[PDB]
């Protein structure tokens, strides 16, 4: 078969969505992983970056 | 920013009252009680406002 058993179309932003899950921790800027502030300066890459 | 403490210093506060302000912040997961307080010096005044005088001064 064609591999494209999947197909996708773009849209306008008809409506907002509440995806903006609140991180109280630090946000690992490049990854967006939410890490607890106690893991800052931890000596360990607990972020990705 | 937050509403100030806008309150009348009613007679019960004389001569002195103490203001303590507090909140609990849940943090990431662990709560902390945060508080501060100040001594408020109040004018010495009577509730009766009683006055006495010789009428034939």
UniProtKB/Swiss-Prot annotation, chain A:
It comes from the Eukaryota. Ca(2+) binds at residues 39, 42, 44, 46. N-glycosylated; contains one or two bound glycans. Not O-glycosylated. Residues 21-49 form the LDL-receptor class A domain. Glycans are attached at residue 2. Disulfide bonds join 23-34, 28-47. It is found in: Secreted; Target cell membrane. Heterotrimer of 3 chains: alpha (C8A), beta (C8B) and gamma (C8G); the alpha and gamma chains are disulfide bonded. Component of the membrane attack complex (MAC), composed of complement C5b, C6, C7, C8A, C8B, C8G and multiple copies of the pore-forming subunit C9. Belongs to the complement C6/C7/C8/C9 family. It is linked to Complement component 8 deficiency, 2: A rare defect of the complement classical pathway associated with susceptibility to severe recurrent infections, predominantly by Neisseria gonorrhoeae or Neisseria meningitidis. Component of the membrane attack complex (MAC), a multiprotein complex activated by the complement cascade, which inserts into a target cell membrane and forms a pore, leading to target cell membrane rupture and cell lysis. The MAC is initiated by proteolytic cleavage of C5 into complement C5b in response to the classical, alternative, lectin and GZMK complement pathways. The complement pathways consist in a cascade of proteins that leads to phagocytosis and breakdown of pathogens and signaling that strengthens the adaptive immune system. This is Complement component C8 beta chain. It comes from Homo sapiens (Human). The chain holds residues 100 to 148 of 591 of the full protein.
Curated annotation (Swiss-Prot), chain B:
It comes from the Eukaryota. This is Complement C5 beta chain. It comes from Homo sapiens. The chain holds residues 522 to 578 of 1676 of the full protein.
């Amino acid at each position: 078969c064609n591999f494209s058993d999947k197909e996708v179309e773009d849209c306008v932003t008809n409506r907002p969505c509440r995806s903006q899950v609140r991180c109280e921790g630090f946000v690992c800027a490049q990854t967006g992983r939410c890490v607890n502030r106690r893991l800052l300066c931890n000596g360990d890459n607990d972020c990705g970056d | 920013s937050y509403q100030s403490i806008n309150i009348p210093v009613t007679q019960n506060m004389v001569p002195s009252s103490r203001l303590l302000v507090y909140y609990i912040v849940t943090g990431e997961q662990t709560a902390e009680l945060v508080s501060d307080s100040v001594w408020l010096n109040i004018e010495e005044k009577c509730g009766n406002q009683l006055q006495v005088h010789l009428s034939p001064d």
